[PDB]
Design a protein around this ligand. Structure first.
Ligand code: QXP
Ligand code: CL
Ligand code: CL
Ligand code: CL
Length: 379
């Protein structure tokens, strides 16, 4: 029984009020501090005619204020459309249109939407009442994803899709003790692993500087703020293995997700220190990270497996007759669907699995299983 994100963050900030929530450069913000500003901004947002269900795009460079907006937007039940800060003004319009945004809140287009100054909203903060009744199935965010061919499709993600990240993952052993690094762009689903596994568990989220990755700054930041849970794309992981693999063993866990990573790169990383290196699978339509496989030995490693699902995630490889290859995902992370309701039927299908009908997302990832109970993608 998952509650909506603000309900979870509320009781998280009430439990651990004095723990550090956000770090930027050297500025620190505690959970009680963050909760007060979130409620103050949410009241400001309501003054600006924003109501529950409004489609609100966010374009704010990495900063403490960015994640206050995220919390405030979902506290007032808005549907956030995070936009990449280096996106060209033309692709901004395509994203706003495909999501049907009524607002764009930005720190720096032309369509049926209002542009709101993020700096002015922060300046207007004076908690105020009247907050919506939010369910786990209420929409929480829209993310754009491209397929093997088509144009960018909008994916409607429910509160449960990221609220599940409040539950500790057994393969990670994470808790409020941990520290996460925010480096993945907010327009990507992978960013949800870093933002919400932190804020919804009482852990710390150190924010990387805005812009393209600065591995020197990322190196000192990973150590200075003692990052324990490091999520990485395949490119950031491979580059670190090549130029500074020692950095990958300051944390306790390193999760590589996004695409096939050469098994030799995992071998160098695992043999380099005490950090548990993971291969992870995620997709936009399942809201965030979905499975994990722990690389155990330098010679234990044939595409590396993606492992076993996260809490409340169901992952099954079905045959060609929609029965048990091809990967299907069910559970709390499944998206509400696409903007196109007809393509929604094409790739979100109800399938009987162990007695009960279950809604599965059709991933289009050819796959098969391991002997030791492990999912393995194979293009
Ligand atoms: N890397 C993430 C972490 C959390 C949430 C989403 C993502 C993500 O890639 N969202 S996507 O929509 O842009 N891409 C989704 C598609 O990418 C591919 N893929 C993702 N992980 C892996 C992996 N370990 N090995 C091989 N292939 C992978 C797959 O074909 C999946 O269907
Ligand atoms: Cl700016
Ligand atoms: Cl997000
Ligand atoms: Cl940024």
């Amino acid at each position: 029984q998952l509650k909506a994100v603000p309900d979870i963050f509320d009781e998280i900030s009430q439990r651990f009020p004095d723990r550090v929530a956000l770090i930027f450069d050297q500025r620190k913000i505690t959970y009680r501090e963050l909760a007060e500003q979130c409620s103050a901004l949410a009241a400001v947002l309501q003054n600006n005619c924003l109501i529950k269900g409004d489609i609100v795009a966010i374009k704010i460079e990495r900063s403490p204020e960015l994640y206050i907006f995220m919390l405030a937007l979902m506290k007032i039940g808005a549907v956030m459309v995070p936009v990449n800060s280096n996106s060209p003004e033309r692709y901004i319009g395509e994203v706003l249109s495909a999501a049907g945004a009524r607002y764009l809140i930005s720190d720096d287009p032309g369509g049926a939407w209002h542009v709101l100054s993020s700096r002015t909203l922060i300046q207007n903060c004076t908690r105020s009442g009247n907050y919506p009744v939010l369910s786990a199935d209420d929409p929480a965010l829209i993310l754009m994803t491209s397929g093997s061919t088509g144009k960018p499709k909008s994916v409607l993600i429910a509160h449960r899709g990221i609220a599940r990240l409040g539950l500790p993952v057994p393969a990670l052993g994470n808790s409020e003790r941990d520290c996460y690094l925010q480096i993945a762009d907010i327009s990507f689903a992978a960013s949800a692993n870093e933002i919400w596994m932190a804020l919804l568990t009482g852990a710390c989220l150190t924010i990387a500087p805005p812009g393209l990755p600065d591995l020197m700054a990322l190196a000192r930041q990973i150590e200075s703020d003692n990052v324990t849970m490091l999520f990485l794309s395949g490119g950031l992981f491979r580059l670190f293995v090549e130029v500074s693999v020692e950095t990958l063993h300051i944390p306790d866990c390193v999760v590589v997700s996004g695409d096939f990573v050469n098994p030799r790169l995992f071998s160098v990383a695992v043999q380099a220190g005490k950090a548990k290196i993971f291969n992870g699978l995620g997709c936009t339509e399942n809201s965030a990270i979905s499975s994990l496989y722990h690389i155990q030995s330098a010679a234990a490693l044939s595409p590396v497996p993606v492992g076993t699902p996260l809490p409340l995630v169901e992952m099954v490889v079905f045959n060609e007759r929609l029965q048990p290859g091809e990967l299907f995902i069910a559970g709390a992370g499944v998206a509400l669907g696409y903007s196109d309701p007809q393509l929604t039927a094409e790739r979100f299908i109800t399938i009987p699995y162990q007695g009960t009908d279950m809604l599965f997302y059709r991933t289009d990832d050819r796959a098969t299983y391991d002997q030791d109970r492990n999912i393995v993608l194979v293009g």
